[PDB]
Amino acid sequence: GWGSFFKKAAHVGKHVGKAALTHYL
């Protein structure tokens, strides 16, 4: 569905970007 990527990607890109960028560094 579309809702997925919306939060799925926002939550995935956000949790990953923060955990990999806002955290890894």
CSV table of N, CA and C in Angstrom, one decimal:
chain,number,residue,atom,x,y,z
A,1,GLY,N,0.9,-1.2,0.0
A,1,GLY,CA,0.0,0.0,0.0
A,1,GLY,C,0.9,1.3,0.0
A,2,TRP,N,0.3,2.4,0.0
A,2,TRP,CA,1.2,3.7,0.0
A,2,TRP,C,1.5,4.1,1.5
A,3,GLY,N,0.6,3.9,2.4
A,3,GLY,CA,0.9,4.3,3.8
A,3,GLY,C,2.2,3.7,4.2
A,4,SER,N,2.5,2.5,3.8
A,4,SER,CA,3.7,1.8,4.2
A,4,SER,C,4.9,2.8,4.0
A,5,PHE,N,5.5,2.8,2.8
A,5,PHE,CA,6.6,3.7,2.6
A,5,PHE,C,6.5,5.0,3.3
A,6,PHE,N,5.3,5.6,3.3
A,6,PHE,CA,5.1,6.9,4.1
A,6,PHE,C,5.8,6.7,5.5
A,7,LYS,N,5.1,6.0,6.3
A,7,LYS,CA,5.7,5.8,7.7
A,7,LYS,C,6.8,4.8,7.6
A,8,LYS,N,6.6,3.7,7.0
A,8,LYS,CA,7.6,2.6,6.9
A,8,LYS,C,8.9,3.2,6.4
A,9,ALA,N,8.9,4.0,5.3
A,9,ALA,CA,10.1,4.7,4.8
A,9,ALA,C,10.5,5.8,5.8
A,10,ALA,N,9.6,6.6,6.1
A,10,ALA,CA,9.9,7.8,7.0
A,10,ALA,C,10.5,7.2,8.4
A,11,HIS,N,9.8,6.2,8.9
A,11,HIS,CA,10.3,5.6,10.2
A,11,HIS,C,11.6,4.9,9.9
A,12,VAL,N,11.7,4.2,8.8
A,12,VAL,CA,13.0,3.5,8.5
A,12,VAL,C,14.1,4.4,8.1
A,13,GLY,N,13.8,5.4,7.2
A,13,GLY,CA,14.9,6.4,6.9
A,13,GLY,C,15.2,7.2,8.1
A,14,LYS,N,14.2,7.5,8.9
A,14,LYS,CA,14.4,8.4,10.1
A,14,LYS,C,15.2,7.6,11.2
A,15,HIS,N,14.7,6.4,11.5
A,15,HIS,CA,15.4,5.6,12.6
A,15,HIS,C,16.8,5.2,12.1
A,16,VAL,N,16.9,4.9,10.8
A,16,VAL,CA,18.2,4.5,10.3
A,16,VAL,C,19.1,5.7,10.2
A,17,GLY,N,18.6,6.8,9.6
A,17,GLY,CA,19.5,8.0,9.4
A,17,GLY,C,19.9,8.5,10.8
A,18,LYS,N,19.0,8.5,11.8
A,18,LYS,CA,19.4,9.0,13.2
A,18,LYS,C,20.3,7.9,13.8
A,19,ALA,N,19.9,6.7,13.7
A,19,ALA,CA,20.8,5.6,14.4
A,19,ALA,C,22.1,5.4,13.6
A,20,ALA,N,22.1,5.7,12.3
A,20,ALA,CA,23.3,5.6,11.5
A,20,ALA,C,24.1,6.9,11.4
A,21,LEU,N,23.3,8.0,11.4
A,21,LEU,CA,24.0,9.3,11.3
A,21,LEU,C,23.9,10.1,12.6
A,22,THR,N,22.8,10.1,13.2
A,22,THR,CA,22.7,10.9,14.5
A,22,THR,C,23.2,10.0,15.7
A,23,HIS,N,23.6,8.8,15.4
A,23,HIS,CA,24.1,7.9,16.5
A,23,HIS,C,25.5,7.3,16.1
A,24,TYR,N,25.6,6.6,15.0
A,24,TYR,CA,26.9,6.1,14.5
A,24,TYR,C,28.0,7.1,14.7
A,25,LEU,N,27.6,8.4,14.6
A,25,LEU,CA,28.7,9.5,14.7
A,25,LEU,C,28.3,10.3,15.9
